[PDB]
Amino acid sequence: DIVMTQSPDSLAVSLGERATINCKSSQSVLYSSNNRNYLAWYQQKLGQPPKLLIYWASTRESGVPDRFSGSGSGTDFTLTISSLQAEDVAVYYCHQYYSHPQTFGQGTKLELKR
Amino acid sequence: DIVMTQSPDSLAVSLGERATINCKSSQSVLYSSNNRNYLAWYQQKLGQPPKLLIYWASTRESGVPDRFSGSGSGTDFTLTISSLQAEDVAVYYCHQYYSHPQTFGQGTKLELKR
């Protein structure tokens, strides 16, 4: 079973500042044949369902703004929020769908500096 | 955009009793070519990440017990928990990955009768 480890676990940044969320897989999820990364990022706001943000490690879902950027490969990946807005406060999860079971990280809680 | 509507929104059953969770799509997610349903069910326990339970509408993920049963097709689907355990208390989400954006339901909160 591939293990998804995110860092940091939580983070507090000022409005309009940049946030960086790491995620490492215990095994490569880059597929040799198609050379595609089976890696997704989801956003979950409080009392709400998850929302798909990024897949194949770097593709934005429809309706997802450009301030959200997915990067990296194989075992190492990063979500960058370039200019943090208040509506971006939430829990962000990485997710691999390379093999079963398809596991998630424990989440990174991103909050506004008080 | 396909809309995923779950019912009931919440539900309280006694231990060892059966729970049934519906989910309707505003559009068919059965794929004509392969005749496969692009429908998933996730379980989210409190303060924890989501966990994939069922995909292609009726396949259990590895490590998922048989008391969890996915059924239905096209626009109409059901998760049945046959004999409710305390560790099954949580929020259950349906999810379509037929087209982008890949949307979720608002969740069904399942709790033990007090």
Side-chain angles (χ1 to χ4, degrees):
Chain A
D1 299 353
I2 309 173
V3 180
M4 304 299 292
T5 299
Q6 290 179 223
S7 46
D9 290 337
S10 51
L11 195 99
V13 295
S14 304
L15 197 74
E17 297 282 280
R18 162 186 279 103
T20 296
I21 300 170
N22 304 110
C23 164
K24 300 206 172 147
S25 55
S26 70
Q27 289 177 42
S28 181
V29 303
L30 180 59
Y31 189 23
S32 290
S33 308
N34 50 19
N35 160 50
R36 287 204 136 312
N37 291 285
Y38 286 71
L39 189 287
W41 292 101
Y42 295 80
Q43 171 192 66
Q44 187 162 35
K45 287 153 145 88
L46 210 55
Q48 259 199 42
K51 182 206 177 86
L52 178 66
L53 265 183
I54 306 285
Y55 64 103
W56 309 127
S58 66
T59 315
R60 299 186 187 79
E61 186 54 294
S62 322
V64 166
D66 270 348
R67 56 173 199 281
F68 292 97
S69 189
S71 58
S73 42
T75 59
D76 195 75
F77 309 90
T78 292
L79 181 70
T80 304
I81 304 163
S82 79
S83 264
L84 188 73
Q85 304 204 293
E87 59 168 1
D88 302 343
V89 168
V91 176
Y92 292 80
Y93 301 102
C94 64
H95 177 217
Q96 68 91 6
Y97 46 108
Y98 177 87
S99 39
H100 286 273
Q102 297 182 6
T103 48
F104 295 72
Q106 299 309 315
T108 297
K109 182 165 196 274
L110 179 76
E111 323 145 303
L112 291 159
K113 265 168 99 280
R114 288 210 152 60
Chain B
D1 299 353
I2 309 173
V3 180
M4 304 299 292
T5 299
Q6 290 179 223
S7 46
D9 290 337
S10 51
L11 195 99
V13 295
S14 304
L15 197 74
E17 297 282 280
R18 162 186 279 103
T20 296
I21 300 170
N22 304 110
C23 164
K24 300 206 172 147
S25 55
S26 70
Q27 289 177 42
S28 181
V29 303
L30 180 59
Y31 189 23
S32 290
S33 308
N34 50 19
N35 160 50
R36 287 204 136 312
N37 291 285
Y38 286 71
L39 189 287
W41 292 101
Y42 295 80
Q43 171 192 66
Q44 187 162 35
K45 287 153 145 88
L46 210 55
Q48 259 199 42
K51 182 206 177 86
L52 178 66
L53 265 183
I54 306 285
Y55 64 103
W56 309 127
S58 66
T59 315
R60 299 186 187 79
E61 186 54 294
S62 322
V64 166
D66 270 348
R67 56 173 199 281
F68 292 97
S69 189
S71 58
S73 42
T75 59
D76 195 75
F77 309 90
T78 292
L79 181 70
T80 304
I81 304 163
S82 79
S83 264
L84 188 73
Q85 304 204 293
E87 59 168 1
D88 302 343
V89 168
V91 176
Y92 292 80
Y93 301 102
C94 64
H95 177 217
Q96 68 91 6
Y97 46 108
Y98 177 87
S99 39
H100 286 273
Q102 297 182 6
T103 48
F104 295 72
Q106 299 309 315
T108 297
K109 182 165 196 274
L110 179 76
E111 323 145 303
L112 291 159
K113 265 168 99 280
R114 288 210 152 60

